[PDB]
């Protein structure tokens, strides 16, 4: 059975006006800005941007890849696909 989301989990993350986007749940660095309550820090592969999202917007990668894991015209997207498949836990600072 599923657990709660935890740092390191791989997802497709959905934001308004964007396709479901390869992403991960990030850690919060010591001394760094925490998310609001019930929100997770989401790191988007390819663009390397962070947003704060709740579970409604988070689709587990394994389950969802056959649907969402296809090339897209949007900037950063196909780079994002490579990252999530090839080095999803790397530092992208």
Coordinates of C-alpha atoms in Angstrom, one line a residue, residues 12-62:
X12 CA 4.7 14.0 -12.7
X13 CA 3.6 17.3 -11.2
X14 CA 0.6 19.2 -12.6
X15 CA 0.4 23.0 -12.7
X16 CA -2.2 25.1 -14.4
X17 CA -1.4 25.7 -18.0
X18 CA 1.4 23.1 -18.1
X19 CA 1.4 19.4 -19.1
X20 CA 2.1 16.9 -16.3
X21 CA 5.8 17.5 -15.7
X22 CA 8.7 15.2 -14.6
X23 CA 9.6 16.2 -11.0
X24 CA 10.7 15.1 -7.6
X25 CA 9.8 15.8 -4.0
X26 CA 12.8 17.8 -2.7
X27 CA 14.4 18.0 0.7
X28 CA 14.4 21.4 2.4
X29 CA 18.0 22.4 3.1
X30 CA 18.9 23.5 6.7
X31 CA 18.3 27.2 6.8
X32 CA 16.1 27.3 3.7
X33 CA 12.5 28.5 3.3
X34 CA 9.9 25.8 4.3
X35 CA 6.8 25.2 2.2
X36 CA 3.3 26.2 3.5
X37 CA 1.4 23.5 5.5
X38 CA 0.2 20.5 3.4
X39 CA 2.5 21.6 0.6
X40 CA 5.7 19.9 -0.7
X41 CA 8.7 21.5 -2.4
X42 CA 8.6 20.2 -6.0
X43 CA 11.7 20.3 -8.1
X44 CA 10.8 20.2 -11.8
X45 CA 13.3 18.4 -14.0
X46 CA 14.6 20.3 -17.1
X47 CA 13.5 23.8 -16.0
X48 CA 15.1 23.2 -12.6
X49 CA 12.4 25.4 -11.0
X50 CA 10.8 24.8 -7.6
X51 CA 7.1 25.2 -6.7
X52 CA 5.0 24.2 -3.7
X53 CA 2.3 21.7 -4.4
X54 CA -0.2 19.5 -2.6
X55 CA -0.8 15.8 -3.4
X56 CA -3.8 16.5 -5.7
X57 CA -1.1 17.7 -8.2
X58 CA 1.4 14.8 -7.7
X59 CA 1.2 11.7 -9.9
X60 CA 3.7 8.9 -8.9
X61 CA 6.2 8.4 -11.7
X62 CA 6.1 4.6 -12.1

